Curated annotation (Swiss-Prot), chain B:
Duodenum, heart, lung and liver, but not thymus. It is found in: Mitochondrion matrix. Homohexamer. Organized in a ring with a central cavity. The ATP-binding and proteolytic domains (AP-domain) form a hexameric chamber, while the N-terminal domain is arranged as a trimer of dimers. DNA and RNA binding is stimulated by substrate and inhibited by ATP binding. Interacts with TWNK and mitochondrial DNA polymerase subunit POLG. The chain holds residues 588 to 649 of 959 of the full protein. ATP-dependent serine protease that mediates the selective degradation of misfolded, unassembled or oxidatively damaged polypeptides as well as certain short-lived regulatory proteins in the mitochondrial matrix. Endogenous substrates include mitochondrial steroidogenic acute regulatory (StAR) protein, DELE1, helicase Twinkle (TWNK) and the large ribosomal subunit protein MRPL32/bL32m. MRPL32/bL32m is protected from degradation by LONP1 when it is bound to a nucleic acid (RNA), but TWNK is not. May also have a chaperone function in the assembly of inner membrane protein complexes. Transmembrane segments: none annotated. This is Lon protease homolog, mitochondrial. Belongs to the peptidase S16 family. It is linked to CODAS syndrome: A rare syndrome characterized by the combination of cerebral, ocular, dental, auricular, and skeletal features. These include developmental delay, craniofacial anomalies, cataracts, ptosis, median nasal groove, delayed tooth eruption, hearing loss, short stature, delayed epiphyseal ossification, metaphyseal hip dysplasia, and vertebral coronal clefts. It comes from the Eukaryota. Signal peptide: none annotated.
């Protein structure tokens, strides 16, 4: 609660690059980082892929 | 309304708390999209209530 997230958003605004945040803490599985194998019934790629998608940018802020 | 928020198992292949966090994010909620549906939907005008018998076993981030 010190402004770290706020200043991250401010940095993205100043640089014009996209800002996206996510909480890895207390997370064990790596699938969401790397999605799934695409063969399991109903699989998506990793959350980083979802960010790359919704951002429409190559150099966003992560 | 959400009940037994404190009782969430948050076990294998689960971790719905993140979604709940994503559900309860003041800003991300406004662009919520599903796995079934990818379009983002506003959630800033919808009121949320949670109920539990204890304030502790509930996730700290939540
Ligand atoms: N130097 C600062 N200038 C402006 N706002 C601040 C400053 N420090 C803290 N805040 C406010 O306090 C809140 C702390 O939340 P947050 O920054 O998300 O926590 P953390 O800093 O741990 O990431 C922010 O919403 C921000 O508005």
């Amino acid at each position: 609660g010190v402004g770290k997230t706020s200043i991250a958003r401010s940095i993205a605004r100043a640089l014009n690059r996209e800002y996206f945040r996510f909480s890895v803490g207390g997370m064990t599985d790596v699938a969401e980082i790397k999605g799934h194998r695409r063969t399991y019934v109903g699989a998506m790629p990793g959350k980083i892929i979802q960010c790359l998608k919704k951002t429409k940018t190559e150099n966003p802020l992560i | 309304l959400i009940d037994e928020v404190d009782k969430i198992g948050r076990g294998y292949q689960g971790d719905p708390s993140s979604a709940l966090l994503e559900l309860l994010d003041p800003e991300q909620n406004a662009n919520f999209l599903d796995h079934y549906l990818d379009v983002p939907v506003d959630l800033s005008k919808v009121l949320f209530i949670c109920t539990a018998n204890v304030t502790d076993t509930i996730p700290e981030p939540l």
